[PDB]
Amino acid sequence: MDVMNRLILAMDLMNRDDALRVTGEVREYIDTVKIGYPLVLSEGMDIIAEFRKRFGCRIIADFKVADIPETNEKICRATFKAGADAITVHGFPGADSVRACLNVAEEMGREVFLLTEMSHPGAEMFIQGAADEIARMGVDLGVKNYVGPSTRPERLSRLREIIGQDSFLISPGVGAQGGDPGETLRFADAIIVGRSIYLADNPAAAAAGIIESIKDLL
Amino acid sequence: VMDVMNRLILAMDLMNRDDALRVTGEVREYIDTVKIGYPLVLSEGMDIIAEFRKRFGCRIIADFKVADIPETNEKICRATFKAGADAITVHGFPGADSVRACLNVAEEMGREVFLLTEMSHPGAEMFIQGAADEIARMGVDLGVKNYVGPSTRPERLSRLREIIGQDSFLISPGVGAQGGDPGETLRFADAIIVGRSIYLADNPAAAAAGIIESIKDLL
Numbered sequence: 001m002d003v004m005n006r007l008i009l010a011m012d013l014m015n016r017d018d019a020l021r022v023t024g025e026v027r028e029y030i031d032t033v034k035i036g037y038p039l040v041l042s043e044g045m046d047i048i049a050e051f052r053k054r055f056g057c058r059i060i061a062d063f064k065v066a067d068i069p070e071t072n073e074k075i076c077r078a079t080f081k082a083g084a085d086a087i088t089v090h091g092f093p094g095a096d097s098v099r100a101c102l103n104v105a106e107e108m109g110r111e112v113f114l115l116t117e118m119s120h121p122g123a124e125m126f127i128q129g130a131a132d133e134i135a136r137m138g139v140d141l142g143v144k145n146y147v148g149p150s151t152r153p154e155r156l157s158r159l160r161e162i163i164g165q166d167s168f169l170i171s172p173g174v175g176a177q178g179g180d181p182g183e184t185l186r187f188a189d190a191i192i193v194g195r196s197i198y199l200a201d202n203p204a205a206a207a208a209g210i211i212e213s214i215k216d217l218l
Numbered sequence: 219v220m221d222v223m224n225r226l227i228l229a230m231d232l233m234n235r236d237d238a239l240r241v242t243g244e245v246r247e248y249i250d251t252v253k254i255g256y257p258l259v260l261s262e263g264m265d266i267i268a269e270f271r272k273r274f275g276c277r278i279i280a281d282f283k284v285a286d287i288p289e290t291n292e293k294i295c296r297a298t299f300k301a302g303a304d305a306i307t308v309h310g311f312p313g314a315d316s317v318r319a320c321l322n323v324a325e326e327m328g329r330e331v332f333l334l335t336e337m338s339h340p341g342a343e344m345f346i347q348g349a350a351d352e353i354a355r356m357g358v359d360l361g362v363k364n365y366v367g368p369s370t371r372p373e374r375l376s377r378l379r380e381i382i383g384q385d386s387f388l389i390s391p392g393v394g395a396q397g398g399d400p401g402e403t404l405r406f407a408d409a410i411i412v413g414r415s416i417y418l419a420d421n422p423a424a425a426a427a428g429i430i431e432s433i434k435d436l437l
């Protein structure tokens with residue numbers, strides 16, 4: 001996956017007008033947008049097609065699928081019908097649940113991103129201790145795309161070690177949560193950035209600034 | 219706690235609005251509590267919650283298994299409650315801050331959180347099962363009153379009931395299609411969740427009635 005400027009916009013604004021306006025303001029800097037439940041549950045799944053129509057960007061549906069296999073299949077089917085290019089999936093619920101998503105993605109010509117360790121403090125309680133094993137599970141299952149935490153570069157580096165250089169790794173927690181763009185790109189292929197851009201006084205300048213700081217990495 | 223008619227909650231996971239409405243309408247005399255998840259919501263929109271309220275006068279549990287960072291969790295809960303859901307399900311495995319974020323919104327908005335502890339499917343054994351007792355204990359410490367646990371593992375459902383105590387509310391999926399028994403499950407759970415056994419039946423009303431007949435002495 002070829003992500004422009006190694007930068008993925010996390011569009012978690014919950015108003016259609018604002019989400020489209022801000023995305024439009026930074027369109028020259030990105031070609032990949034992560035759309036999650038905040039926007040989708042506020043504005044409907046039709047928002048995905050609207051983004052493709054307006055920007056032609058790739059869309060990662062960040063739904064962190066975390067149900068039983070039978071339900072996971074339905075969620076993936078509905079999500080890809082709406083035009084998402086990829087979907088995020090929790091690994092914690094186990095291999096059968098991940099495989100359900102992989103099956104639908106294969107059928108519909110899409111990608112699964114396996115979420116291993118999360119970026120927030122609570123991830124330390126249960127997820128972190130399982131994360132290496134979740135990553136190995138991904139490798140066993142043939143998963144090629146992964147998500148890991150900007151806020152813990154030592155953990156992000158470990159995840160990269162496990163999945164290898166051929167796998168694709170994207171990483172949230174940059175900016176607002178404290179992660180550094182350049183340090184994160186030592187290990188991740190692309191960074192995910194939400195609030196630092198979409199809540200900025202000037203989102204275009206925010207995006208441009210981030211890219212300037214990583215210019216030697218592009 | 220919510221007063222669930224016949225101790226039976228319909229898992230409405232049909233993805234077509236017309237079929238979902240038909241089947242729910244057919245079993246409405248038996249069930250006043252419906253669980254609506256992402257299969258139906260992602261297919262038909264959050265307005266489906268509105269349509270169910272308008273048509274049936276059933277309580278709605280939004281089974282969204284919220285599993286994000288605290289800030290995103292808050293947004294998901296707000297949007298879900300804005301749409302009219304009585305309650306939302308939340309994963310415990312992302313940790314206490316993520317659960318607390320949901321509890322705070324539910325408190326502010328006058329609604330309820332159901333904490334998902336152990337899951338019912340085979341994959342749950344890999345990571346969730348080993349964390350489930352602690353997730354439950356965490357829920358108790360956080361003041362969580364409502365919980366979800368697995369019909370497919372009676373021994374685990376029993377232990378989870380012990381941890382949360384008799385005053386907590388416990389609902390349990392995995393009944394029917396996944397192999398769990400209605401009566402056995404109601405030894406521990408306040409209500410059973412049933413999806414395919416009802417909604418794929420040639421006569422969903424007869425299917426619901428049959429389940430209820432089988433647990434009549436437990437009502």
Ligand SMILES: O=c1cc(O)n([C@@H]2O[C@H](COP(=O)(O)O)[C@@H](O)[C@H]2O)c(=O)[nH]1
Binds near residue numbers: 010172194290
């Ligand atoms: O571990 C993770 C996994 C995520 O998907 N995310 C997501 O990435 C985005 C981070 O946005 P922000 O830059 O505003 O912190 C949010 O949409 C969040 O749900 C995360 O923050 N941590």
Ligand SMILES: O=c1cc(O)n([C@@H]2O[C@H](COP(=O)(O)O)[C@@H](O)[C@H]2O)c(=O)[nH]1
Binds near residue numbers: 068366394
């Ligand atoms: O551990 C769990 C938690 C659930 O919410 N569920 C949900 O409960 C329902 C079970 O439906 P069914 O009776 O068709 O197996 C589905 O909506 C599923 O997503 C589950 O099966 N196991």
